[PDB]
Design a protein around this ligand. Structure first.
Ligand SMILES: [Ca+2]
Ligand SMILES: [Ca+2]
Ligand SMILES: [Cl-]
Ligand SMILES: [Cl-]
Ligand SMILES: [Cl-]
Ligand code: NA
Ligand code: NA
Ligand code: NA
Ligand code: NA
Lengths: 439, 439
């Protein structure tokens, strides 16, 4: 009776990348099909602009600002921060207490001490830990043998990581068919350095050329070892995204062949905005590491056949904080002691209206030290206030009339500015928001 | 009558590298000759364990902790810090006010905003700015065309940077022979990535093999793209250091051919300890980025024929703070308004005794974020207290009996511990020492 929950999170996948989100270059048929079988959110948010902090929001269901991880965890030597299993009842653990078998396939990025790994996925209670990082991922390795994933000791010659990751998801499904299960499918894709199988790269090179003219693929991308430019379409990103799409298809197949598709919930998400000179954030401002819409707005598709109406579009603000209470309602559990900063979305998923509760972000960039990106932000309705700390200033946008955040309203609407500043300052005190790292 | 001052600073050159400092592998004949013509210091210190902070101590003559630059300046986007010409009467400017023509050849690392460059060597008053960095140096480029030095628009095919730098020093000497001059010769060597001319590399490869056996050079160093290992002798470092040595020779020649060697002061120094898996810090603990002796103890040779007794060894603690008041005494000037944290060494250079005033370091690693290296330190006489902040603790060493800092005395000598802690805490308040960057 308790539904299976499959949470599929891409890495650094931008708002503008999916077919269902307006992209005519990339091919995401299976994710488009998931979109036509589910609810697509146009204003879904990561609770942070970067990997580790967003991933902490999901597993804790607490504001990154409260947890004290607001930026990516660097190598062991550069941080005293990690997610402590003795400090939080994590999402996997709450679903265990609801009778679920729990599993993670892939990226943790919530402990970078690989000597002890006291904050690793296993230490956090996961019943199955499949292909998690065994050292600092950095630029990664998408081809077997997988240099950041020791526990993938066996694999096929030149095996592509996304393909392995999704094969492990299918297997995990097959093996645990008899009982409720939570599968956290944490893709290493589409993280730089960009790498995909040869045939897929070729396909999107040929598709690039057919569009920008013969030889243009070679032109903008041997010269390109990192496969990056200011040109919107990226054949490497496309080819990596296709590999993800096929993987989502294979998971969708496995659910039918095993007869679980009826009572299995599928979520597709991304941990932060697309990376500059790589990802497509459509008309949204900036991207990864910024609190501008491009760094925090994410594709979100929730499928639950019968319970969620297919091919629906939802325009209400939601965030990565919401998954924890939503999965706990879906699994028939209550928040046992641990406080939660998100909201159950089941009502919204079933057709209900939104409460318009304010949403908060804090980026003091403790790890990147990006002084110009150091900021805090509040969204209430269509109004978004960002507070910047280097070059101190307040910026106000109406995301309805100005989704690209191109027209600052702060001086033209001072009453709304003052009102969102109050909510933001009160929040910063509530969560004991870390001061930004400046002179 | 006013002496010429030539300040030759190597980058990341360790205490254990020079012939005069015990090295039997590297060849430094000209620096050994400078050692036999001057005073060699065995306990000379950089005021900081890393580039930018030590270089600020020299140009300001103020504690890095006071200036607010205690760690290297990263790329523009990662910092709001720079050395502000409106905040400090810099060393070059104080010598200008004493009737000197001032010149810098090479590395600044006191502003990383290359868009405006409001804190660049020219903005700081240097009459001649020769081959300074035009973008973030990072791993550098020692072969013309010099990718980090735009203002070296002309040069010979495959020209080696250290050779160019020293040719510019000779020229600068020749051109400004008629008047007093200050030449700040800031070498990019021996900074990683390690690179030297082919013949010099070969020489030290052959010398490596002759010592560790045939083929061992190839063995420990194509496999080695960064030319680094745990083996003490490094043929790349040797070959780079030889290039520096020859350059010092060429400067020594030029002074005689132009008849200035009599009233020209030569200093050879290094900005911080040797880099791990690259530099030799002899028996000293750790290296670059640590306040252990290996990160802060530097070769120092001061030559001034007649005024300074040749082939002398001085065991009294000195630091990079001392150059500013020492050059100002040598040039007949007084500290005009600007406060100074160092001491005139002319008395010590002329045979006089040392006052044993305490010496201070503060490394909160604002840029590296090295949590285990985050510390503050005081030296008085032979006693050195380090205070560590990650894993909070006090460490006490007797540098006379324990120069390798292998035997912590803190619990065995609590009265001395308490006394140095007092001096260190009082100092931290005086300079408003930045809190380290932790959870
Ligand atoms: Ca990410
Ligand atoms: Ca240095
Ligand atoms: Cl360390
Ligand atoms: Cl800080
Ligand atoms: Cl920036
Ligand atoms: Na826990
Ligand atoms: Na590989
Ligand atoms: Na100045
Ligand atoms: Na070059």
């Amino acid at each position: 009776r308790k539904p299976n929950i499959i949470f599929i999170m891409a890495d650094d996948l931008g708002w503008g990348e999916l077919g269902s989100y307006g992209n005519t270059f990339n091919e995401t048929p299976n994710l488009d099909r998931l979109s036509a079988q589910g609810m697509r959110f146009t204003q879904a948010y990561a609770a942070a602009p970067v990997a580790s902090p967003t991933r902490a929001s999901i597993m804790t269901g607490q504001y990154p600002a409260r947890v004290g991880i607001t930026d990516f965890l660097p190598e062991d030597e550069k941080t005293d921060r990690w997610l402590d299993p003795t400090k939080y009842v994590t999402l996997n653990e709450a679903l265990s207490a609801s009778g679920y078998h729990t599993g993670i396939v892939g990226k943790w990025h919530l402990d970078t001490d690989f000597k002890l790994n006291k904050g690793g996925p296993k230490a956090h209670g996961f019943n199955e830990v499949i292909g998690t990082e065994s050292e600092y991922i950095a630029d990664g390795d998408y081809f077997f043998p997988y240099s950041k994933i020791a526990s993938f000791d066996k694999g096929t010659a030149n095996e592509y990581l996304t393909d392995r990751q999704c094969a492990e998801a299918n297997a995990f499904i097959t093996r645990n068919r008899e009982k409720p299960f939570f599968l956290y499918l944490s893709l290493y894709s589409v993280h730089t350095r960009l790498e995909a199988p040869v045939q897929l790269v070729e396909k999107y090179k040929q598709k690039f050329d057919q569009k920008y003219g013969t030889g243009k693929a070679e032109q903008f991308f041997a010269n390109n070892v990192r496969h990056e430019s200011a040109q919107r379409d990226n054949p490497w990103l496309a080819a990596m995204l296709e590999s993800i799409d096929t993987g989502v298809g294979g998971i969708m197949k496995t659910l039918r062949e095993t007869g679980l598709a009826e009572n299995t919930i599928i979520v597709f998400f991304s941990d932060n905005g697309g990376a500059g000179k790589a990802g497509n954030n459509a008309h949204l401002r900036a991207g990864k590491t910024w609190l501008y819409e491009g760094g925090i707005r994410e594709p979100l598709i929730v499928s639950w056949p019968g319970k969620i109406k297919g091919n629906t579009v939802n325009d209400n603000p939601v965030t990565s904080l919401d998954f924890y209470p939503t999965f706990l309602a879906a699994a028939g559990g209550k928040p046992t002691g641990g406080r939660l900063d998100g909201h159950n979305l089941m009502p919204l998923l079933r057709g209900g209206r939104a409460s318009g509760r304010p949403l908060f972000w804090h980026y003091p960039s403790e790890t990147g030290k990006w002084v110009n990106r150091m900021s805090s932000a509040v969204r209430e309705g269509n109004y978004k206030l960002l507070e910047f700390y280097n070059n101190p200033r307040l910026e106000l946008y109406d995301l309805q009339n100005d989704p690209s955040e191109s027209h600052n309203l702060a001086t033209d609407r001072p009453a709304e500015t003052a009102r969102l500043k109050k909510l933001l300052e009160d929040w910063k005190k509530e969560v004991n928001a870390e001061a930004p790292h400046l002179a």
